[PDB]
Amino acid sequence: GVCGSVWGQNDIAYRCRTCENDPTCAICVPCFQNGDHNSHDYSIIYTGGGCCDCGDETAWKPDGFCSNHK
Amino acid sequence: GVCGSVWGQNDIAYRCRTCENDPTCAICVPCFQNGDHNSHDYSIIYTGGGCCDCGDETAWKPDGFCSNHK
Ligand SMILES: [Zn+2]
Ligand SMILES: [Zn+2]
Ligand SMILES: [Zn+2]
Ligand SMILES: [Zn+2]
Ligand SMILES: [Zn+2]
Ligand SMILES: [Zn+2]
Numbered sequence: 142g143v144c145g146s147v148w149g150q151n152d153i154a155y156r157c158r159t160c161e162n163d164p165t166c167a168i169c170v171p172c173f174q175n176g177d178h179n180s181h182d183y184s185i186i187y188t189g190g191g192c193c194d195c196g197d198e199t200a201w202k203p204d205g206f207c208s209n210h211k
Numbered sequence: 212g213v214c215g216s217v218w219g220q221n222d223i224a225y226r227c228r229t230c231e232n233d234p235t236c237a238i239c240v241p242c243f244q245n246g247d248h249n250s251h252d253y254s255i256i257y258t259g260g261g262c263c264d265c266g267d268e269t270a271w272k273p274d275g276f277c278s279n280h281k
Contacts, residue, residue, distance in 0.1 A: 142219050142260045143217050143218075143260040143262050145215040145261075145262030145263075147215040148213075149213075150212065162235055163233045165236070165269050165270050166235070188267070189267075189269070190212045190213040190266065190267055191213055191215075191264075191267045191269070192213050192214070192215030192262035192263065192264070192267070197258070197259075197260055197262070198259060199235050200235050
């Protein structure tokens with residue numbers, strides 16, 4: 142299932158335009174590192190805060206899920 | 212900041228088409244009840260799981276935030 146780690150106003154996370162369902166979706170750094178995005182169009186971003194969409198297939202492509210949320 | 216409560220495969224949450232940035236965004240039930248959506252086009256939904264977007268203005272309209280995440 143879904144990770145939902147929360148980052149805050151100034152914390153970084155990962156946007157991955159290849160896996161994302163929508164430009165608003167992001168995942169935490171550990172999820173990103175524990176997955177395979179090797180040729181994806183990803184970027185470090187500062188949203189003003191959010192909760193990790195890893196494990197949520199409406200928001201993110203399953204092959205973009207980390208090991209711990211398959 | 213952002214709530215990020217996680218619901219699971221069969222758990223309910225709230226979609227609110229008036230506050231939502233995108234059809235993929237949802238918030239947990241307590242956030243929804245602790246906010247004002249009185250004439251909004253909202254529905255109970257079963258995503259297969261997600262994390263609550265309440266408190267995240269890229270995902271959800273601030274006037275749609277609950278008391279505890281303003
Ligand atoms: Zn995560
Ligand atoms: Zn993950
Ligand atoms: Zn990716
Ligand atoms: Zn919530
Ligand atoms: Zn809330
Ligand atoms: Zn609403």
